[PDB]
Design a binder for this molecule. Structure first.
Ligand code: NAD
Ligand code: NAD
Ligand code: NAD
Ligand code: NAD
Lengths: 371, 367, 366, 366
């Protein structure tokens, strides 16, 4: 197959959908790989690294979009709908559910739209989201430590203190992928770390992973209120895999906090777990203050570490791209029930039930269209 | 003794030379303690907490300086020379060898000028500087990781990577207090960490402290070049520091790599650091490499730094209060090395030599 | 039941199919246990330790094979065919797909041939192969360290260096049983350790298990090329594709070392054209030391004997308590051990391999 | 100053007295550095890496020895005496108490003979011996592990066992540099580790350094007897009394292994009557494998070269910058390195050993 990778145009998106490594994998299995000039530059991948891995650097966005399969990171924007052909394979984060101009255009132009965030294994996990939760978790406590400094608005402490000086107190609410990764960094910076979860089995796994390095605590509104009161930093790391994030930290809890404490709501991309998070912050404008407490709620924390973020995402997308390339999108999706759950749009139909259901649009079961 | 702690007035100085706990130590020993209103605000110590520990809050700087002994963090500014007077005991970071005007004013007003940073134990250690090298070391890698992010001008990596993704490389040049404390934080963030030192015995001690968590490496120009070339972050942690990292080495680094120097207000080890920045505008780029050039990293964590400093300064201050400066220094040879100015003389050789001013033997004045 | 353990007679085979602790389990459950004199000597178990645990020591191999069930480690050699007889239960590593003459002798003599290596749990795992994978993994890096010494042909480094001196770099390809166990020894000897696996979930589990002691890296030909170029030691622990090409070995520094856990199974190195023995253990290609000695668990026969017999004797106990038929109908994993029964090959792959008739084992056991 | 590094010519000596990094230090301080072609090949340093660091490669040993200061690892052999000349500075391991012919040649030719091994800090430590003690310690347990494998004569265990299988037991006698470094490798290979020392303060420091990873035990003939009887591996790391008697070795299980870091210095084992080489490395007494190969750092020449040159070249730099006289009057540790000067033996022990006149070094340097 002819495989195309255009540069990300969405503002300050420094991630790309392939590395020299993933180029070399597709080239060696017999595919043609075209990379838009400068696509890797945001992540430190020069055009000459991509070239020596076997890829053709094309001058123009349309020459990458030309290819049978387009690999991207972000949603195609207004300006990119144009490039949609019939039987174009598009593989990227789509979140069609609240993107109606995108969904009509992939319906109308008969693009095969394959979504990173709906590829799903039999145990129900989303392998293609996990890496971004890992990056966001590791970032959460690094960001927390920065905001604890007096210059950024915090009370002016190191999480680890120093000899003869008390350590900062970190509460992580949610003990899954994001929270576990956040706890690793909070332990490593020398914080006194409490992790809360509702799942007693996850608490036992965290106790096996961390031992005496953390305290595991059963999550309930009382325990959350007690931890928040005494916290220098609270990391929000809850997912209810369908829903909006539950509001676990109340205004009354935030008001119980000491001035210059910090909240980082990893869970903001689902609405966030803090009642007091009234809006989404940006890397440019990361924080506001309410009740003397610094609030950080950046979506795309992993956007801050695009080189790490790109490796982690393409480590697990390119193996699914190789299947589509090697066997055509059809044989590969019949062969791989997890890839199949990726098809969001096919031959003008909206084959994913929840996206048709949220745009008031027709839903055609995907299996009937494939046989 | 009547003891005074004014607010630090230097720009964005948020540390303070006493905490409520130190107030309690001095009040219980029978001393009167006067704290200037808001002196602890920048470190999160309220007037009310100081008052509850036994302090009198005074409204005016002048009323804290009126005390027999004044404790501070920074050197008095020109606008504070007015408070100097014969027999005033001043105990603070003075750095008199760099400050001709302050030296002359302490001499002219016959101030007992005691420098935190020249208090020196029999083994050569400077115990009132150590806590600030510890904070600076812990901060160096936190700041370096922050500048590694794409938004702050770096190449955009986590030092610890994530599963399936390689870690960042950290080179720490210097395995003393600052460097050891930097290595702790670099290990904790998940970096591949190399520590260079010239002293074989310190590398053996570091091997005992860290084992497999780091690689210890003998310092020479070749090994420094080799580590710098492949580093994402380099931390300068050597005690006027030699220029160990050359322009050629910085130019060998990948773009969006980061350099941080603990020693930057003493020149630092990097040829390419032409100036000191502030928290407002903290970095510049040379050869695509981020140069974090903020001096006084401990000042970014004033509460931790205030606890770290006052943990070791207040016991000395307590000796001066109980016994008077004279018996305290005659009883404590480490505290005696703290005396820089006394009764209109410079008694610290290096300060006399720095300004070509007369030197006086400290023991001869104390008798 | 009467249970016999002959001495292993393959050249330099020093493992044994039971220890005194396994004798004790079988004798306390009421079985008669016969051990050939010297059977355990190669693994440091005296005739006397077997006797005190309740075994009868027999002077001749014949008398151990005359038992109703024979426990062994390796496959019977040609000169052991003479001991086969209708209704003999033989429980050992058989590898019949590779052994036509052995397969035909088990058919003709109507032996119940139970293969350690086809006993298989519901989850697909081979619990009687696992312990040799663990031992080979642990051994792989110990051998690598040895071959990095100059007098053995290596560049002459310690993996952990010394204070002021850089560490060796160890790349482990495959994060399963063997590769995880290799990583434990690489970490403990003080190497800089990278483990590659194609499976993102395994990389996460490895991160949970090792944290900062190793780097986990997604496997692909590019990551492999980059790791191999920098490596002092590469351990192949994949289960067998040629992941490490000749160009990759050529990129290496002279006196680097390659070890495959997978050697008699082909291995992952294009440049390992043949297998060697302990008296001429390595060859050099492009200045790189290729360690090619099969069966590294054979070099620690006492450890390997304990690790194998720990998990074999519970299955033997079932056969002895119930007889093979009810043991197999009660234990689906043990049922999959049966390769030959009443003159039939009951394991499809083995039948295929020799162009012989296959019979469904369930039909014969009824 | 002009500084020469000949190739070591003692049989199988693969270490070298400088690396490219040491060349670079000496050339940047303005010295001329001459390296004999192949000097570094045995430690993986090409003529080319030396040239890029600023050395001149010389075809003949003669041309390296013609330098004003000669850096070596080992003592000059008889056939190297011809290179000696009045005022030559030779900095190397000399061991003159053991080498009459070498001592007489250094006197007669008026060589400034500076011994790496008599450089001594104010605290009594020998900073240029320490790194070989570290390397030998790390090597001792790696060798022990190798000799516990059956094909090398051992009982056939892994030190760390495997899951469900007991670990090997390692006794380290002496908790100094070598014995501490041995303990690190014993712990990392997964051994049960006991370290004995007569010094209670060292046992506390060892407890601080290892905590629950080892047991610390006060040394006395009873504790030694009990540890040795149970040991799979005993590492002698004492600095040389016969702490391990023949009765103690006789109490051991067959295929156990003894390694002394101290072997060419006598060692602590009554039963090690002689030293061996890598081609016949062990002998067996009372079924116990005695490893008797001298100079284990010689087996990792690259690691050992880095570890030695890390601490030797700073002293060489001083000699080259100031000349030997002012370097020694400025550096009391380096002063103690001087063994021969202007036709005098200036190190009492060496004079004593050969019944020769002693001269006070301070009197000659004035
Ligand atoms: N752009 C970004 O910044 C970015 C990118 C990707 C993912 N993430 C986010 O990381 C956040 C967490 O996701 P994850 O992958 O760790 O989810 P996860 O499913 O792996 O773990 C979430 C945990 O929350 C626990 N939980 C549920 N209700 C709880 C309660 N009341 N109290 C405490 N714990 C509770 C669950 O038991 C589970 O262990 C999500 O919002 C996810 O979107 C953010
Ligand atoms: N606010 C602050 O940042 C702050 C406060 C106090 C002191 N300091 C500064 O911290 C710096 C260093 O602090 P420390 O506590 O680590 O010092 P330290 O005195 O404990 O030791 C410095 C280490 O560097 C090593 N060293 C010397 N030369 C070297 C070389 N050429 N290559 C490699 N290693 C070499 C020494 O052997 C030593 O182990 C000093 O420059 C001092 O001025 C900073
Ligand atoms: N005599 C003996 O030495 C002996 C005895 C028994 C087993 N073994 C050997 O053990 C070896 C494997 O042992 P195991 O139990 O650890 O295997 P395993 O199946 O437990 O693990 C294999 C791992 O390799 C990974 N993998 C697959 N393809 C890969 C690629 N291209 N790159 C990187 N990783 C990849 C898998 O995801 C898996 O985690 C086999 O080769 C087998 O022959 C040897
Ligand atoms: N070529 C080489 O292999 C090489 C090179 C240099 C040094 N070395 C060797 O290293 C060996 C020792 O090295 P080190 O630097 O570790 O020594 P060290 O002096 O640092 O430590 C010796 C330790 O043994 C202890 N000790 C004394 N008597 C004891 C007894 N009866 N039982 C138990 N402990 C006792 C001491 O308290 C001390 O802690 C020497 O024997 C020396 O020959 C070898």
């Amino acid at each position: 197959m002819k495989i195309g990778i255009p540069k990300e145009i969405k503002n300050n998106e420094n991630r790309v959908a392939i590395t020299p490594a993933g180029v070399m994998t597709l080239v060696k299995a017999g595919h043609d790989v075209y990379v838009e000039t400068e696509a890797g530059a945001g992540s430190g991948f020069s055009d000459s690294e991509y070239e020596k891995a076997g890829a053709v650097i094309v001058t123009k966005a349309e020459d990458a979009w030309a290819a049978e399969m387009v690999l991207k990171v972000k949603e195609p924007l207004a300006e990119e709908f144009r490039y949609f052909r019939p039987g174009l394979i598009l593989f990227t984060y789509l979140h069609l559910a609240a993107a109606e101009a995108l969904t009509k255009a992939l319906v109308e132009q008969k693009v095969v739209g394959i979504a990173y965030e709906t590829v799903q294994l039999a145990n129900g996990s989303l392998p293609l989201l996990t890496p971004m939760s890992e990056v966001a978790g590791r970032m959460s406590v690094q960001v927390g430590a920065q905001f604890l400094e007096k210059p950024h608005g915090g009370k002016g402490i190191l999480l680890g203190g120093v000899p003869g000086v008390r350590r900062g107190k970190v509460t992580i609410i949610g003990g899954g992928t994001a929270g576990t990764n956040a706890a690793k960094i909070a332990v490593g910076l020398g914080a006194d770390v409490t992790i809360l979860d509702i799942n007693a089995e996850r608490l036992r796994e965290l106790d096996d992973l961390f031992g005496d390095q953390v305290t595991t605590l059963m999550s309930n509104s009382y325990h959350i209120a007690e931890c928040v009161r005494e916290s220098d930093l609270v990391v929000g790391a809850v997912l209810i895999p369908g829903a909006k994030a539950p509001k676990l930290v109340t205004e009354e809890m935030v008001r119980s906090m000491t001035p210059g404490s910090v909240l980082v709501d990893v869970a903001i991309d689902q609405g966030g777990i803090f009642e007091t998070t009234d809006r989404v912050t940006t890397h440019d404008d990361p924080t506001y203050v309410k009740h003397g407490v610094v609030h950080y709620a950046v979506a795309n924390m992993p956007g801050a570490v695009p080189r790490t973020s790109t490796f982690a995402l393409t480590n697990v997308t390119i193996p699914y791209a190789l299947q589509i390339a090697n066997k055509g999108y059809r044989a590969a999706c019949l062969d791989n029930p997890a890839l199949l759950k990726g098809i969001n749009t096919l031959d003008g139909h909206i084959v994913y039930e929840a996206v048709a259901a949220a745009h008031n649009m027709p839903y055609t079961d995907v299996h009937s269209l494939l046989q």
